[PDB]
Ligand SMILES: NC(=O)c1ccc[n+]([C@@H]2O[C@H](COP(=O)([O-])OP(=O)(O)OC[C@H]3O[C@@H](n4cnc5c(N)ncnc54)[C@H](OP(=O)(O)O)[C@@H]3O)[C@@H](O)[C@H]2O)c1
């Protein structure tokens with residue numbers, strides 16, 4: 001199945017590396033935890049922002065242009081991206097906006113981190129009908145010495 005994983009600020013603003021202020025090792029640990037040894041599908045801008053393949057994961061990059069890095073697998077359509085994952089239990093789509101929009105209809109799971117921040121941003125996580133999703137897990141954390149904002153992990157499952 002297909003899952004999306006995202007960090008959402010207020011108004012469900014999303015962004016790239018440099019745009020995202022917070023320092024949530026807790027959130028990056030959550031990401032690592034939930035994506036490890038699963039294929040990750042991302043759009044070209046997200047790829048360029050991360051700057052290096054995620055280790056121990058198959059990295060699949062969407063782009064309309066031929067690939068420019070032999071360290072990752074390049075694909076030119078959603079269906080090709082899915083095919084390039086082979087037969088795994090769970091495919092992780094790690095953004096960005098354009099990619100989340102295309103994969104949401106296909107997804108069965110959302111892993112969201114709701115961050116208590118207003119950030120500069122126009123790019124938002126896709127709107128999804130709440131009627132089609134059930135929250136099955138959530139866990140709130142206050143900011144601390146090594147995490148800058150409060151945040152809440154959430155997992156939703158498609159009914
Ligand atoms: N300055 C501003 O006001 C502003 C506002 C909004 C966003 N932004 C910028 O937007 C970028 C992030 O956008 P995003 O989150 O939407 O990026 P993203 O999803 O991570 O990457 C989008 C790219 O993925 C590829 N892609 C996606 N779907 C595809 C498909 N079906 N077939 C082939 N290729 C596909 C395309 O690459 P190719 O281009 O290679 O085809 C597309 O440009 C950042 O660089 C951010 O700075 C800036």
Ligand SMILES: Nc1nc(=O)c2c([nH]1)NC[C@H](CCc1ccc(C(=O)N[C@@H](CCC(=O)O)C(=O)O)cc1)C2
Nearest residue numbers: 005006007017027028031032050054055094095113
């Ligand atoms: N939960 C969550 N938080 C986020 O900040 C993001 C998402 N999801 N989803 C999409 C995008 C992911 C951007 C993104 C992903 C991974 C790394 C990265 O390098 N992760 C390492 C751990 C970082 C470290 O070593 O400190 C990893 O191996 O997973 C950086 C940026 C932003």
